[PDB]
């Protein structure tokens, strides 16, 4: 296992966002041309095992452990009735105190806040990606497509990401092989070598959230200089066409930096190899 391996993301120019926004309130539009310098991206979401190495090394207590609770999705025991703040839910106990990660060491780490993620990435000699870096990487060298692999959800009749099948939130059929999270190396890689960049766990980025974007061309943009929420990308194992259609590279959402939940993780990036 090499679940902390990084891949080189080539220098290039790409179209960020879309002029055919599917969720207009999220500022998916306008499409804008963004130039990104070559850098490195984690191939995988950070796994439980990799996060445990960090905690073993530093003694780091995550914000959810300090707060004493975190949000858990009801269907596997708030912003929605299916989200409960569960006392004692955290990265080691993803559904609460009588859950464990012992049988899922290679699944993405969850209940990690933006601050937790920055701590991990920095410890590792890395950083969070910007939203623009994240999206460029997600798109995997294709232009103006819905998904890392193209415009069809199940190309060649194959599942390409871990999202929801069935009627959300009552019934997840597990058609794609995973009801909850999958191992960080599950499903095909995209054109750049990235796994689970859409679906599985949501992923934190470094940017403050705004929905107001210029059409101006930019170089290595960092997002707005201030805000209250940080940007997350990519959707999760819970995502579905009918409710949270955000397993698209252009999609975007946000949370306050001290937030944590059972569907939210991260991956790191770096300017050079650590």
């Amino acid at each position: 296992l090499a679940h902390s391996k990084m891949v080189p993301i080539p220098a290039g120019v790409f179209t960020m966002g879309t002029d055919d926004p599917q969720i207009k309130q999220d500022g998916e539009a306008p499409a804008r041309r963004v130039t990104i310098d070559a850098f490195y991206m984690d191939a995988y979401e950070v796994s439980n095992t990799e996060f445990e190495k960090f905690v073993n090394s530093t003694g780091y207590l995550t914000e959810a452990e300090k707060f004493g609770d975190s949000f858990v999705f009801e269907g596997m025991l708030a912003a929605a009735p299916w989200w409960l703040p569960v006392k004692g839910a955290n990265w080691r106990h993803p559904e609460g105190p009588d859950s464990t990660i012992l049988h899922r060491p290679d699944h993405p780490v969850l209940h990690v806040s933006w601050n937790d993620a920055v701590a991990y990435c920095t410890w590792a000699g890395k950083r969070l990606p910007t939203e623009a870096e994240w999206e460029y990487s997600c798109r995997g060298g294709l232009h103006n497509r819905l998904f890392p692999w193209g415009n069809k959800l199940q190309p060649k009749g194959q599942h390409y990401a871990n999202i929801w099948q069935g009627e959300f939130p009552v019934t997840n059929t597990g058609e794609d092989g995973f009801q909850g999270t999958a191992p960080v190396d599950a499903f095909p890689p995209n054109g750049y070598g990235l796994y689970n960049i859409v679906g599985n766990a949501w992923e934190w980025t470094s940017d403050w959230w705004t929905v107001h974007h210029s059409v101006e061309e930019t170089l290595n943009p960092k997002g707005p200089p201030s805000g209250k929420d940080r940007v997350k990308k990519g959707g999760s194992y819970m995502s579905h066409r009918s409710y949270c259609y955000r397993y698209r590279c252009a999609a975007r959402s946000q949370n306050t930096p001290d937030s944590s939940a059972s569907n939210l993780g991260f991956r790191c990036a770096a300017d050079r190899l650590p």
Binding site: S236, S253, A261, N263
Partner: peptide, 6 residues
């Protein structure tokens, strides 16, 4: 809404 904030 996909993840509630704390």
């Amino acid at each position: 809404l996909c993840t509630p904030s704390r």
